[PDB]
Each structure stands twice: as C-alpha cells, then as structure tokens.
Design a protein around this ligand. Structure first.
Ligand SMILES: COC(=O)c1cccc(-c2cc3c(=O)[nH]ccc3o2)c1
Ligand SMILES: COC(=O)c1cccc(-c2cc3c(=O)[nH]ccc3o2)c1
Ligand SMILES: COC(=O)c1cccc(-c2cc3c(=O)[nH]ccc3o2)c1
Lengths: 122, 122, 122, 122
C-alpha cells in the first residue's frame, strides 16, 4: 500500500523501492527513456512519521545514470510526496543534471514531473 | 573523485559526505551552528566514472527533514555537478517538497539553487 | 494557430488568450472560473512560425497577481508547448515567485506543472 | 519601478526593459554579441504596488527564441523578484521549453537561475 513496492511512471519507467524503518529509500530504477539500459541503483529518504492530517508523505531519491552497462554522465533527483489513495501514487518533480563543460553549464539541467502508480500505463 | 569531505553553501549550511567507490553518497547535512538538532541524514549518488573531457561530475542527494528531534514533513533533493580544479565547487539546483493535502499540492514544492565550496562563506 | 481562445486547467482556472501574428500572447487569466475579482492580465510570447513535424509550439506567459481588487505580491510564469489536433493541449511547467526579504528569498519560488485543454473537461 | 533600464546577467546577456505604469514589462533580450541576429522581443508583468515591508517586487517575462533571422522553436520564461537599492538586482529562475514530440516531452524543459544587475559581469 505504502511506499515499498514496484511503481511505474507515466513513461513506463520502473521504480523498485524499499522504505526502511530508518527513513531510507533503497532500490533500483529502470528507465523507459534516455541513454539507459537495465537497472540503476537508487537511494533516497522519506518522512517515516508523516503528518496525520491528510497530508502526503514527503520523499526524494537520486539515480546516477551509470551502471555496469552504460554511463550517461548525468543524475536525476525526484522530489515529491506519496499520496495514500484509492490508487496510491507518488507525485514528483525532478531535476536531471548532466555533467557539462562550464560553458555549457547553463544548459545542464532538465526539469519535469513524474507520477508513479503501482500499475504500468495502458 | 574530489567529493568526499565537508562542503559549505552560501547561506551557512554544511554538509559532510563520503563518496563511495561505486557511486554512493552518504553523510549528514546541518546548520552553520553545528548543533545536533540541526543535523539530518543525507544519501545520494554520483557518477564514479566521469568523462575526461573537462565536464563536471553529475551527482544528487536527498535530505528528509526529520531527525530524532524535529520533523518538517518535507524533503529536499539537490541535483548538480561537481567541478574540480583549483577552486572546486558543487553547483546545484534543488527541489523542496512538503507533504500537503491534494488541495494544497500547488504550494508543495519550492525550487532554488545552492553553490557549495570547501571553505566557509565570506 | 490553434492557440487563440479559451483554455481550462485541470483545477478550476481559465484563461483567454490571443496569439498575435507577431508572436505576442495577450489575454486574461481567471484564477477562479466565474469570479470577476479573480481576473488578471496575462502577457507572453510564442513561436509564431513553429515546425510542422509533430513537435509542440513553444510558448510562455506571465501573470503578476495584482488586479484592481487584490495583490498577492507574486507572479507566475508558465513555460511550455501547445500541442494541436483534435485534443489540443498546452502542457506547462511554472514558477511562482513571491516578493520576499533577502532572509526569506530561499522560500520565494514555488514550482509546478499544469495542463490546459479546450474542453472544460472533455 | 527601479526596474526600467538595462540589465545584465552573469552570462552577459543584456535585458533592456521598460516597466509600464500598468504592470507591463516590454523590451528586448539579447545574448550578448550586440548583434541584431541575437536580439529578441520580450514581454512580461511585474507587481506595480509591492509591499512596503522590505520585500522585493515580483515579476516575470518571456522570450520566444524567434526573430527575423533565427528560430530555435523554444521559449524561456524568467520568474523572480527585483530587489532595490544600493544596489539593485533582479534574481530569477527560468524555464526554457523547446518544442518536442510527445515521445520526447520529458526532455523539453531546461531550468536554471539568472541574476541581473545594472553592471556587466566581472
Ligand atoms: C543525461 O542522461 C539522460 O538524459 C538520461 C539518461 C538516462 C535516463 C534518463 C531519465 C529517465 C527518466 C525518468 O524515468 N523520469 C525522469 C527523468 C528521467 O531521466 C535520462
Ligand atoms: C520546510 O523546510 C524544512 O523542513 C527545513 C528545515 C531545515 C532546513 C531546510 C533546508 C535547508 C536547505 C538548503 O541548505 N538548501 C536548500 C533547501 C533547503 O532546505 C528545510
Ligand atoms: C533553445 O535556446 C535558444 O535558441 C537560445 C538562443 C539565444 C539565447 C538563449 C538563452 C539565453 C538565456 C539566458 O540569458 N538565460 C536563460 C536561458 C537563456 O536562453 C537561448
């Protein structure tokens, strides 16, 4: 129900996460897009004692897009909240920074928004 | 990698990180004051095999603003790049999401930027 | 070409825009559908010679949240693209900056996304 | 109000703006060679009656990157605040959306931050 489980964004990427009792997020991410193949390590944190007033649960995680197969020389962070609901979801915005020369730094960082559910889109 | 150690942002904050051999970032984020109550766990990832063309090293990390003392029901992610050389820096953009109700989700996420140096501001 | 007219977001706001031949966007943003004291000037720019390759038409606009009735001492910019066809959309990300003191400048800017359609909901 | 004038960002782009009595911003933005080919129309909005408590003045503007010479099929919005006096600055964050196909929309938008002053960067 909660955060631990297998989630998918609107692009069909797969987010496999475990929420630890200590506030840790660990798991793997597999992207449906970009210069990516197979699973990447993720790590992050979440509020392990959220408000009880109907607010969502704040969280964030990072993937650096290097694994044993490929290296895109970039990293994404997702910042968002888990929303317990009929259909649970994690609503995020993200920042994807590529390593760049200093002259190209102004154009280093993409921004977007991903919504995760436990079902893959159709 | 150049990353392990203590970094300071432009507003006082301090973080101490270990860059592990296969891409992990682990450490703590705190205030200039350095009191324990201001200290929070951080975890993230970085490119452990960056390009050799003078490009920066992509990284990101998360802090959930809960520790043993306090809970802001929110998390920050920093996404950016480490720029080495004579005056090394970590240049970041960040997203701070607070847990909200759905009606308030429009006011859930702050955005900004932080630059970290190895020496304290001023 | 397809932009001019009335758009609805997913949360109860409207706007009416004219896309001029010179790349101008002008109109009115009504934050609460039906409420006249909730109408604000919008101004922006769009690509007046977009590609005809399946790509969206890039655009942006600003609303400063002051009118004759109210003033939130803030302004939103929406940056995005218009997607035509039978189910036309304007997909945006936005930045909402409030005037703050320097001390509070870290908390000045909210980020989010909205999607506008031509049907109120269809 | 303090806003009308010639501003420069940290990259040396030149923002020539007029703040009209009604909340309008109008002018030109150029990236920096002084050349016509590099100059683009901007429009935006600002809070024409800011708070009197020390807070900055909220504002935003858009440039679509089409002129008589070039067309990048993209647009940037800047959202920020003017901070008056000894000396004046406009602090912004920006969103740069390029037209994309639907499949590529996740990579449509860059994010960054620009600070403008009435002097060139040194
Ligand atoms: C510089 O390298 C890239 O641009 C890159 C490489 C591999 C994957 C991705 C990727 C996947 C993904 C996603 O599922 N949601 C949000 C961002 C996002 O980004 C990006
Ligand atoms: C609702 O806010 C909080 O719970 C809280 C508490 C303590 C620190 C912060 C904080 C520090 C910091 C930083 O150095 N750069 C970027 C964002 C950011 O946020 C936020
Ligand atoms: C696709 O992009 C372009 O074709 C293009 C052309 C000329 C200038 C720019 C430009 C200048 C500038 C700046 O000063 N601050 C923030 C963003 C930004 O973008 C972009």
């Amino acid at each position: 129900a909660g955060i631990t489980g297998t989630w998918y964004n609107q692009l069909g990427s797969t987010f496999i996460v475990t929420a630890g009792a200590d506030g840790a997020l660990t798991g793997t991410y597999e992207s449906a897009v970009g210069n990516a193949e197979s699973r990447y390590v993720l790590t992050g944190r979440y509020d392990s004692a959220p408000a009880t007033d109907g607010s969502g649960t704040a969280l964030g995680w990072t993937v650096a897009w290097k694994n044993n197969y490929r290296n895109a020389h970039s990293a994404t962070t997702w910042s968002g909240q888990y929303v317990g609901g009929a259909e649970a979801r994690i609503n995020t915005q993200w920042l994807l920074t590529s390593g760049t020369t200093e002259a190209n730094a102004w154009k280093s960082t993409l921004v977007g928004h991903d919504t995760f559910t436990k079902v893959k889109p159709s």
